[PDB]
Design a protein that fits this description.
mainly alpha, 2 domains, Methane Monooxygenase Hydroxylase, Chain G, domain 1, 74% helix, small GTPase binding (chain A), globular, homodimer
C-alpha cells in the first residue's frame, strides 16, 4: 500500500460515503412543476410568482450540490484509473490493493447508475432549473450561481444519464493524458469487471447465497456501467460482433429481469452509448433495444 | 418592386392562421410526465408519442413561418429606408409599408405573449427529440432540430427573430445611414405613444383594439431600436423615452401587458447597462 494509493483510497472513500446522501437528496426531490406551470400561465399574478420562486430555490440548491459532486466523482475515478492500471495484475503478491480499488470503482458505478435512473424518472429537474435561470435574470435587473456554471449545469441536466456521461468523458480524458500506457490496461479493467459481473449473475444456481436482490441489483448496474465506459474508450467498442464484451449476452440478462427493474439501464444503453447506432451492430441487438 | 408589398400580405394573412394554431396548442404535458415516471409501461410511451407528433408538426410550422416573417421584414426595411420621406408625393406608399411593418409587430408580440404563457411547448419538443433518438435505433425511417430548440428556448422567439433580422439588414446596408432605419422605429414608437396619451378619456381613439394594437407595435419597435441603435433605447438622452414608454404600459390592466413587460425584461440589449436609470429597473421589478 503506497502513500499515493492510500490518498486515492482516502479521497474516494469520503466521496463514496457522501454518495448515499446525494441519492437521499435526489430520492426526496419533489420538484416545483405545479408552482411553475401556474406562475407561467398567470404571469401578472404576483403571488403565483413568489410561490414558484420560493419552491425552486431549495431544489436548485440540491441541483448545485449534485453537479458539484459530479466533479468530485469525475476526479475520484481518474484517481482510481491511474492507480488501478499502472502496476500489473498480481493475484499472489498485491491482491488486497487490487480488490480494494476494484471495489471502489464498482461502488462509483453503482451510485452513478442509481442516480441517473432516478434523474430519468424525475419530470421536474430540467424545467425547475430552466425557470430558475429566467427568474434569476429578472432579479438581476434590480440586482452565488454565476452564468458560465449555470450553462455547464444546463448541459449536465440535458443529458439522459448525467453522471454516467460525466464518467465516460472522465475515462475518455484519462486515456488522453496517459497515451504512454497501452489502451488494453484500461479496456481490460472494464472488460474483466463486465465479465465477472456476468458470472455472478449467470453462474449461481437458483436460490443460493449469491441470488439475493442486493447482489443482482448491484452487478447489473456495474456491468452496464463498465460496458458503456468501454464502448467510449475502446476503438471498436462494445457492439462489434467479436467484442470481448458480448453485448447480446449482457442485454439478454437485462431482459431476464423484471421489466421495471432495468428499464433505466436499457435507456442508458439506448442514449449514452457511442456505437449502438452503427451499421456494423447486430440488427438483433437493435431489435432488443427498440 | 410592388411584388415585395404583395409578398407580405400573403404572409400577414397566413399569420392569423399561425396564431389560432398556437391558441389551440393542446400540449402533451400530463402524457409525458406519466411516460417519464413509468418508463417500462409501453402503453404510456405510445400515448405520449401519439400526442406529441401532431404538436411538433405545429412547432415546425411556427418556426418555418418565422423564416418567412424574417425575410418579409427585411424586404419592408429595404423599401422604407431607401427613399426620402415624402409627406405629399409618395405618402400612400409610405403609409402602406409602415402599416405592414406595424402589422408584423402586432402578430410578433401576440405570438410571443401566447408562447410565454404555454408551459408545454419546450418540454413537448424536448421529449420529441429524446424519443426520436430511440426510434432511430432500428431506423423506423438534425440541423433543423437544433435551430428549433434554440428558437423555442427564447423568451420571445418571434421578436428575437426580428431583432436578429433588423441587426442583419443594418449590417448588410452599411451604405444607408443607420438613422434611416432607427428613425423609422423611433417615429412609429412616438406616434404609438401619441395615439395612447393624447386622446381624451372618451373618444373615437379610446377603444380596446386601438390601445391593444399600439402597445404591441410600440414595444415591438423600441426593442428593435434597442438592438440596432448604437446608444440603445434606455440611454437618458434617447428619442425613445423608455421611462415614458413603460408608464403607458403600467397604466394598463396588468394582465394585458405582462407579456410586453417580460419582452422588455428578457429580449432587450441595454436594460442591464451600468448607465441605465435605476428608476427604469425599479419599474421592471
Amino acid at each position: 500500500p503506497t502513500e499515493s494509493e492510500k490518498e486515492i483510497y482516502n479521497q474516494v472513500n469520503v466521496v463514496l460515503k457522501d454518495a448515499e446522501g446525494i441519492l437521499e437528496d435526489l430520492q426526496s426531490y419533489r420538484g416545483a412543476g405545479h408552482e411553475i406551470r401556474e406562475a407561467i400561465q398567470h404571469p401578472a399574478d404576483e403571488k403565483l410568482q413568489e410561490k414558484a420562486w420560493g419552491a425552486v430555490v431549495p431544489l436548485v440548491g440540491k441541483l448545485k450540490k449534485f453537479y458539484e459532486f459530479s466533479q468530485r466523482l469525475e476526479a475520484a475515478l481518474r484517481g482510481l484509473l491511474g492507480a488501478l492500471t499502472s502496476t500489473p495484475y498480481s493475484p499472489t503478491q498485491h491482491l488486497e490493493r487490487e480488490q480494494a480499488l476494484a471495489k471502489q470503482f464498482a461502488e462509483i458505478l453503482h451510485f452513478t447508475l442509481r442516480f441517473d435512473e432516478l434523474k430519468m424518472t424525475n419530470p421536474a429537474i430540467q424545467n425547475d432549473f430552466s425557470y430558475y435561470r429566467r427568474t434569476l435574470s429578472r432579479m438581476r435587473i434590480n440586482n452565488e450561481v454565476n452564468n458560465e456554471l449555470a450553462n455547464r449545469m444546463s448541459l449536465f441536466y440535458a443529458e439522459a444519464t448525467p453522471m454516467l456521461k460525466t464518467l465516460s468523458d472522465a475515462t475518455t480524458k484519462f486515456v488522453s493524458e496517459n497515451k504512454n500506457l497501452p489502451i488494453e490496461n484500461t479496456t481490460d479493467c472494464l472488460s474483466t469487471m463486465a465479465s465477472v459481473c456476468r458470472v455472478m449473475l449467470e453462474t449461481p444456481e437458483y436460490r443460493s447465497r449469491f441470488t439475493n436482490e442486493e447482489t443482482v441489483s448491484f452487478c447489473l448496474r456495474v456491468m452496464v456501467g463498465v460496458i458503456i465506459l468501454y464502448d467510449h474508450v475502446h476503438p471498436v467498442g462494445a457492439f462489434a460482433k467479436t467484442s470481448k464484451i458480448d453485448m447480446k449476452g449482457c442485454i439478454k440478462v437485462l431482459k431476464d429481469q423484471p421489466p421495471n427493474s432495468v428499464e433505466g439501464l436499457l435507456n442508458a444503453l439506448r442514449y449514452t452509448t457511442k456505437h449502438l447506432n452503427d451499421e456494423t451492430t447486430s440488427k438483433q441487438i437493435r431489435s432488443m433495444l427498440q
